[PDB]
From a paper:
Given the auxotrophic nature of pneumococci for certain amino acids, the Ami ABC transporter system, orchestrating oligopeptide uptake, becomes indispensable in host compartments lacking amino acids. The system comprises five exposed Oligopeptide Binding Proteins (OBPs) and four proteins building the ABC transporter channel. Crucially, SBPs determine the specificity of their respective transport systems, thereby governing the range of molecules capable of entering the cell. The five lipoproteins exhibit pairwise sequence identity of ~52–60% and share a very similar overall folding.
As we observed in the case of AliB, the analysis of AmiA structure (solved at 1.50 Å resolution) revealed an unidentified electron density trapped at the substrate-binding site. Considering the precedent of this observation in previous reports for AmiA and the identification of the peptide’s nature, we modeled this decapeptide reasonably matching the observed experimental map. The three-dimensional structures of AmiA and AliB revealed the capture of oligopeptides during their expression and purification from E. coli. To determine the identity of these bound substrates, we isolated the peptides bound to AmiA and AliB following established protocols and subjected them to liquid chromatography followed by mass spectrometry (LC-MS) analysis. Surprisingly, our analysis identified a total of 356 distinct peptides bound to the AmiA protein and 393 peptides bound to AliB. AmiA predominantly recognized peptides consisting of 10–11 residues, while AliB favored 11–12 residues. AmiA and AliB showed a tendency to bind peptides with a hydrophobic amino acid, particularly valine, as the first residue. Notably, AmiA exhibits a stronger propensity to accommodate a negatively-charged residue, such as D or E, at this ligand position, a trend also observed for AmiA’s ligand positions 4 and 5. AmiA was solved ab initio by using the Arcimboldo program SHREDDER deriving fragments from a template with 26% sequence identity.
Author numbering: 33 to 659
Write the structure that this text describes.
């Protein structure tokens, strides 16, 4: 039935603790059940959720939220527990601080006093700038004005948590197979968790905003990538409400004929997929290298910027994207920049434009660069070979023997991840020569792969030389959400994308990341002129692009052919945060029949007009909240 949403999830959560986790697998299982102060409506506006109203001081430092009365916490079986209050947001942030949240970067330099509490120089949380002035008045005090502060409040570190419940559960709190170990205040109740099988929700029939909830049930089935045709097959049977299509499937010509009037393409998402370079590899439990000399050679090569540039310029991103999208749709998903090029603009210039204007200082090879989505602006075999020749001269003078062996891990279950990594291998080896670079693909089980990538505990666990296993999506509406996480001090995220968690590692200094820190920090200090702030963050992105420490390849979502029974443009629209329709299913409506491309385009053209007007009205209302 249309009120029974069915689709898939790709990884079992390590935790249900939404305050501590920075991983989408926790968002997938909690957002539908946990509301914070705002959501996102179908036009992308912030919509009142637990905050019924808000104000900001004239100096921009104090935000005050009127907590909606009558919003309740419920158990997984629908029993009322307590009333959501401002004290739950004080407790949420204290819990995030005390248990060292993986997402603390969003809050630690923003909320007054929080950095001192995290370091231990203050142990009294009353010195931290979150206060329950009364049970329905929540006040945050910031270190500096942040026009993007409210956009942070759709991210999970600012969600509420009832302290009495948390204390009552002890070490059983937020356990990943136990829906009774959280309480729910959102549009759905988390009902079922079965490892490698399902995530299950039911509509919260006592939800204050249930008039905006149009699904009775949500069921997500585990999908490990071993059968990419499974999505379309289960869509056709009616089990799934949606299906991402893979044109490389052997049955695709049949699918494309049957659904010729229904397949449509989604817009590219804001997250970035690509290949991180481990500049400080600690462990060799997944390697093809046979000698310590090869290990030393690879470590030295990965510290060489020209070597990394050679890999970056040798990667054919269209062919990489074609492994999941086919050749005809391949270019749509290509991305050339860590920050999505139009994520922000300074007047008429996109962020990508600002980066392109600063990149040529690093070399004439960047003059004329096209950083726009939807085309491969970085692939250039001639430039790849030229950079490699410089690297090889420098490395051979230091005793390094060639070829350089690169370990890239894959989950043996995900066929089209293997195909993507094989395309990387073919690109690099054909352009640069197998006498120069050998890509050694390390096959392992799904759990083994997660343990050295997505769920790696520390830098010692990042057992790889190059890896495309983990993407990054933006958490709030400012370039810092992409660029701050690669600073030398951002150890929770530097391990994932760059292999290090020691801010003082000599590998980190050798690749110049201290200069990156200073560029990011100079941008962060600009709070009086957004255009200048964005120009300064573009300087940091230009450094990152030249450094080739992360090899961008594609948007991490979107730019894909899909089938749908979801009524077009009814779901939440979010470019950042945890309340987009990928994870949060308020507002969404389903229909009986498969959506047609004509239905979708008609809705899109009306939505674009309505969104522009709605966003403009919202912007004009901002000043009325200044008190």
């Amino acid at each position: 039935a249309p009120k029974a949403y069915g689709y898939v999830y790709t990884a079992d959560p390590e935790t249900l603790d939404y305050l501590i986790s920075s991983k989408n697998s926790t968002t997938v299982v909690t957002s539908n059940g946990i509301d914070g102060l705002f959501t996102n409506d179908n036009y992308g506006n912030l919509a009142p959720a637990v905050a019924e109203d808000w104000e900001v001081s004239k100096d921009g430092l104090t935000y005050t939220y009127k907590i909606r009365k009558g919003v309740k916490w419920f158990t997984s079986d629908g029993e009322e527990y307590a009333e959501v209050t401002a004290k739950d947001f004080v407790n949420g942030l204290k819990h995030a601080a005390d248990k060292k949240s993986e997402a603390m970067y969003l809050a630690e330099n923003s909320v007054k006093g929080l950095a001192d509490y995290l370091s231990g120089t203050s142990t009294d949380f009353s010195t931290v700038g979150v206060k329950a002035v009364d049970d329905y008045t929540l006040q945050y005090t910031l270190n500096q004005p942040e026009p993007f502060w409210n956009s942070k409040l759709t991210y999970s570190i600012f969600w509420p948590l009832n302290e009495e419940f948390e204390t009552s559960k002890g070490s059983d709190f937020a356990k990943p197979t136990d829906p009774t170990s959280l309480l729910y205040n959102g549009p759905f109740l988390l009902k079922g968790l079965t490892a490698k099988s399902s995530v299950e929700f039911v509509k919260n029939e006592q939800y204050w905003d249930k008039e905006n909830v149009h699904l009775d049930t949500i069921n997500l089935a585990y999908y490990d990538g071993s059968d990419q045709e499974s999505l379309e097959r289960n869509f056709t049977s009616g089990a799934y409400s949606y299906a991402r299509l893979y044109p490389t499937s052997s049955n695709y010509s049949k699918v494309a004929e049957e659904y010729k009037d229904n397949i449509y393409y989604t817009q590219s998402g804001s997250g970035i997929a690509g290949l991180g370079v481990n500049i400080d590899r600690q462990s060799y439990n997944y390697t093809s290298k046979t000698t310590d000399s090869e290990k030393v050679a690879t470590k030295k090569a990965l510290l060489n910027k020209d070597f990394r540039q050679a890999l970056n310029f040798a990667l054919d991103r269209s062919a990489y994207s074609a492994q999941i999208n086919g050749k005809d749709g391949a270019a749509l998903a290509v991305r050339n920049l860590f920050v999505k090029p139009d994520f922000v603009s300074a007047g008429e210039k996109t962020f990508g434009d600002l980066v392109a204007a600063q990149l040529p200082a690093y070399g004439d090879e960047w003059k004329g660069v096209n950083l726009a989505d939807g085309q491969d602006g970085l692939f250039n075999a001639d430039k790849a070979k030229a950079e490699f020749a410089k690297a090889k001269k420098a490395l051979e003078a230091d005793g390094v023997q060639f070829p350089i062996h690169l370990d890239v891990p894959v989950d043996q279950a995900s066929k089209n991840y293997i195909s993507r990594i094989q395309s990387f291998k073919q690109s690099v080896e054909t352009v640069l020569g197998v006498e120069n670079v050998v890509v050694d693909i390390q096959q392992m089980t799904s759990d083994e792969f997660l343990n050295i990538t997505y769920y790696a505990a520390n830098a010692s666990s990042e057992d790889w030389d190059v890896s495309g296993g983990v993407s990054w999506g933006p958490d709030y509406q400012d370039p810092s959400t992409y660029l701050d996480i690669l600073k030398t001090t951002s150890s929770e995220t530097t391990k994932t994308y760059l292999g290090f968690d020691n801010p003082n590692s000599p590998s980190v200094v050798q690749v110049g990341l201290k200069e990156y820190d200073k560029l990011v920090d100079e941008a962060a200090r600009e709070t009086s002129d957004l255009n200048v702030r964005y120009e300064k963050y573009a300087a940091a992105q230009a450094w990152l692009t030249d450094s080739s420490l992360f090899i961008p390849a594609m948007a991490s979502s979107g730019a894909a052919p899909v089938l749908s029974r979801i009524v077009p443009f009814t779901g939440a629209s979010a470019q950042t945060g945890s309340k987009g329709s990928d994870v949060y299913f308020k507002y969404l409506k389903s229909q009986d029949k498969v959506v047609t491309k004509e239905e979708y385009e008609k809705a899109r053209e009306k939505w674009l007009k309505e969104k522009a007007e709605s966003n403009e009205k919202a912007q004009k209302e901002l000043a009325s909240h200044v008190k």
